Paper text:
Our comparative bioinformatics studies suggest that among those reported as glycosyltransferases are also pseudo-glycosyltransferases (such as VldE, EC 2.x.x.x), which do not recognize sugars as substrates but rather catalyze the formation of non-glycosidic C-N bonds in the biosynthesis of C7N-aminocyclitol-containing natural products such as acarbose and validamycin A. Validoxylamine A is generated through the dephosphorylation of validoxylamine A 7′-phosphate by VldH while validoxylamine A 7′-phosphate (VDO) results from a condensation of GDP-valienol and validamine 7-phosphate (both are pseudo-sugars) by the pseudo-glycosyltransferase, VldE. Similar to OtsA, VldE is comprised of two Rossman β/α/β domains which are oriented in a GT-B configuration.
The first crystallographic structure of VldE in complex with the entirety of its products, VDO and GDP, was elucidated. The hydroxyls of the donated cyclitol make numerous interactions with the backbone amides of VldE at residues Gly384, Gln385, Asn386, and Leu387. Also conserved is the interaction of the β-phosphate with the formerly bound carbon of the donated cyclitol. Upon the binding of the phosphorylated acceptor group, the guanidine moiety of Arg326 enters into an interaction with the phosphate oxygens. This interaction allows Tyr159 to swing 110–112° to make an interaction with Arg326. Within the VldE•GDP•VDO model, Arg326 and Asn325 interact with the phosphorylated cyclitol and most likely help to ensure the proper position of validamine 7-phosphate for catalysis. Despite the conservation of the interactions between the catalytic site and VDO, there is no observed conformational closing of the catalytic site upon the binding of the acceptor cyclitol as was witnessed in structural studies of OtsA.
Numbering used by the authors:
A (entry chain B): 3 to 74, 78 to 263, 270 to 481
B (entry chain A): 3 to 263, 269 to 479
Write the structure that this text describes.
């Protein structure tokens, strides 16, 4: 019976009042990673450590600082109250202003970025935030004789080294949900950050990414920057200062637990509907999707076709995100002016059910990200689509390593190639689409949240034996 | 006695009239690669094929289509054959090869999030590029038709397509392709449209030897090959590619400077007198990073100790018609204007003119040299400047110049994107005492001195000879 300790920046919690009693209710969101882990047979018990980012979180933390047991089987939820100034700066450190641009290829080098004092301060703040997490995690696991640590996502990259210092023999997995960039791009970052982040990650027993390309890039970055590290590209390992680290690819597609926005159905009725969906993040590439649709339309055959750009607002305070929405609006305005009024609409709202409705209704799905750690939407959409919609998928999504063969895989920067794919996908007959969609669904279906959790547990257990042995 | 055939986009030629007779003169520029090659002991004779890009070049080609026997000292003659491309094709290819396309691709100018977005303009550019490549191959083969065992040396990126076409006609010839600019990471290389990112690799790989100035570029190339050609096999240790029966060797052959390498630009000396002089020099190309140099200088000044210090931004105008170059000059001007407004009038000057002698004078006069490129294929300036500097100037060198693989230890190596690190290096370099600078400069000069044009040519000939045996 392993005692599991899960850490991630955000723990999904729902705060409300009972409709009958009016009593205040805090209750964990269904299908959460912690909930799934709670279920593997091996697991005796689990605690979950995350950041308090809301007033409610804050209150709950003060209220139960050691933590609160949450019934589901039970998982102990411990929220961290960071210093507010530090927490916010770290949030800006993790945004397209810094680390998001670094792992998601947002910088052109010729003009950006130019690191100043702000970068040094952001890094200092990042160390303090990392220390909070490590301390909360260790404290939470103090009684445990054999704690298993699962650290999730980029914000926590510094945590493994600090865990390892206090717990030299613990299984530590770090899972990164976003890409890792080429060695030349990774080293854009200031010296203390580009080496310092590698110092924090490498003491993990296992580092996981969604895609092989990300493991390869990671290993090249290590090789490039730490002259004392030894990488093995075949074995996927790093040996560094007596640290042996295993890199693993553990793809995720979707959670088995997965109506239209106002006026969309009637607006779409009588037309084929091209759907592009993603957060208001420049990587999602909706501007280029729209320009590509416009080029396809010029080719003809698209007269009864409409396009919906479905966006979920996120991080709009970040200039790059705001500017992306501005570029999307511009391209959509210009598409209408040329093609005809109301050919293209944006529907920008945070309602996951609406988006799923868009997925079902689509006659063509476009997930053409400039880059993407994985992209779960491209697994969800074909699985719920009832129209035998083709999928246009960018070759730079991690998901392309699993589904690329089953989709129209495109260079997300080539408007011509993407236009041609849109024309071909729409020209394709019902029987051909129907058969391709069934192949597509079968390729997507196995990659479930649960298999992903199992992959982590097994891969960790196995890497722990190896590390223990060498 | 090997018969050598050299190809490059441009062949440095001087057109003028004899000052005594008034007769028209065309003579090869001294210190040229072709001139150097002709001097090697192995070489029996050499021809040089290049593009006509001037009206003079054009008239010369029409008058001597087969070629022209240009004269060298020591009674060594190099045959020079200029190609008259179709003008429309030639100009578009110039645009393809401009930051508008291929330059941004090998020199990391694209943010991915907003640029680039390839259109029909790229497809046409590629078609034009095939036609330009076919002209070169035809001129080169024709020029070598009589030769029993022609040795082909193909220089620079514009000719990347040439080796495959040479190999088709001449399956057993030694073919070297030397690329003078960086090769980008696999993920960045594959930004380019499918027919370009694979088609360029198809063009290069049949060469016997592919050379770059730096190991990083060879590694990136190999990763690109591995990423895009599932039928290729790479060997990172051996530095080789095997692809469709083609065995290709990658080599790093660093170049520093030509031993053949004055006075300051008007008013620079008096303006600089009484002050320590920070010098940054490069073409008006965004990779040269002068904007960031200036911002870093400003941050250094805020720290104090720089009160008697001035900065000169020496630029050589080039490709100003390309928007990214014009915009770079615009960002530089802005930063220089803002530096003056904050630090004091005339603290920083730009001197932007095409006069190599002026730049060399700037190198001699500098109390601190800054070559902080965002990326560079090599950067010869960083080798030339220390070698002529009389002031024991420190050198701030970007870790992303190919030259950093030879000189990085002997310079203040910096991340070109970190204004803070670069400001600190400027303060430290200027704070350093005369004895420390003197000793560092002598070690710097010793590290730079061996990397001559001639050694580089010899490296190509030997490396090719050796790779030809292996491939054979
Ligand atoms: N909260 C919210 N989630 C959404 C909305 N639309 C889609 N989603 C989903 O959020 C996830 C998006 O993840 P993914 O495609 O991997 O891209 P990511 O945003 O970079 O992590 C998927 O599970 C989608 O179902 C929305 O409007 N609101
Ligand atoms: N024509 C010309 N050449 C210059 C001038 N200033 C410097 N140079 C030379 O041009 C070369 C610059 O090459 P390098 O630093 O390798 O950068 P590149 O411009 O990217 O190839 C050096 O040989 C310089 O000495 C100038 O004003 N005009
Ligand atoms: O909550 P935010 O506004 O900070 O951003 C939403 C998520 C985006 C990013 N999602 C990733 C996760 C996943 C799925 O786990 C991948 O499919 C995505 O490609 C990748 O962008 C990021 O990694 C997460 O930490 C963020 O919470
Ligand atoms: O075409 P131009 O003259 O506007 O550009 C000047 C040169 C810049 C570039 N010079 C390279 C040569 C060298 C040395 O030959 C490297 O040191 C530089 O880093 C690299 O930028 C390019 O490769 C050449 O083809 C160009 O002629
Ligand atoms: Cl890169
Ligand atoms: Cl990259």
């Amino acid at each position: 019976g392993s005692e599991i300790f899960l850490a991630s920046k955000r723990a999904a919690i729902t705060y409300d009042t009972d409709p009958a009693t009016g009593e205040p209710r805090a209750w964990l969101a269904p299908g959460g990673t912690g909930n799934v882990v709670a279920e593997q047979a091996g697991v005796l018990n689990i605690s979950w450590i995350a950041s308090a980012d809301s007033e409610d979180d804050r209150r709950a933390s003060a209220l139960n600082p050691d933590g609160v047991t949450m019934e589901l089987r039970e998982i102990l939820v411990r929220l961290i109250r960071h210093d507010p100034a530090v927490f916010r700066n770290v949030q800006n450190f993790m945004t397209a202003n810094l680390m998001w641009a670094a792992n998601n290829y947002g910088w052109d080098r010729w003009t950006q970025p130019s690191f100043g004092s702000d970068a040094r301060e952001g890094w200092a703040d990042f160390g303090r935030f990392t220390r909070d997490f490590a301390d909360a995690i260790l404290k939470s696991s103090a009684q445990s004789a054999d704690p298993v640590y699962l650290v999730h996502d980029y914000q926590l990259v510094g945590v493994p080294a600090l865990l390892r210092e206090q717990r030299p023999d613990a299984p530590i997995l770090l899972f990164v949900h976003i890409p890792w960039p080429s060695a030349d791009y990774w080293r854009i970052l200031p010296k203390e950050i580009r080496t310092g982040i590698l110092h924090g990650m490498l003491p993990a027993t296992t580092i996981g990414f969604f895609a092989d390309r990300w493991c390869r890039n990671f290993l090249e970055s290590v090789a490039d920057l730490l002259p004392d590290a030894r990488i093995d590209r075949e074995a996927m390992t790093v040996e560094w200062r007596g640290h042996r680290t295993r890199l693993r690819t553990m793809p995720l597609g979707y959670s088995p637990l997965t109506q239209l926005p106002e006026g969309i159905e009637e607006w779409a009725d009588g037309h084929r509907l091209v759907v592009h969906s993603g957060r208001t993040d420049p990587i999602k590439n909706a501007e280029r999707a729209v320009r590509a649709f416009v080029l396809a339309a010029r080719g003809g055959g698209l007269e009864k076709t409409r396009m919906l750009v479905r966006m979920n607002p996120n991080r709009l305070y970040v200039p790059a995100n705001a500017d992306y929405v501005h570029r999307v609006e511009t391209a959509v305005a210009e598409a209408n002016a040329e093609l005809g009024s109301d050919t293209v609409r944006i529907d920008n709202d945070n309602d996951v059910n609406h988006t799923i409705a868009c997925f079902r209704r689509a006659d063509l799905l476009i997930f053409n990200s400039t880059v993407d750690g994985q992209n779960l939407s491209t697994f969800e959409a074909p699985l719920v689509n009832e129209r035998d919609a083709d999928v246009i998928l960018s070759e730079t999504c991690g998901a392309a390593e699993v589904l690329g063969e089953y989709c129209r895989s495109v260079n997300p920067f080539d408007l011509v190639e993407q236009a041609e794919a849109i024309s071909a996908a729409l020209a394709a007959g019902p029987r051909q689409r129907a058969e391709a969609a069934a192949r597509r669904r079968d390729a997507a279906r196995p990659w479930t949240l649960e298999a992903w959790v199992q992959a982590q547990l097994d891969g960790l257990a196995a890497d722990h034996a190896a590390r223990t042995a060498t």
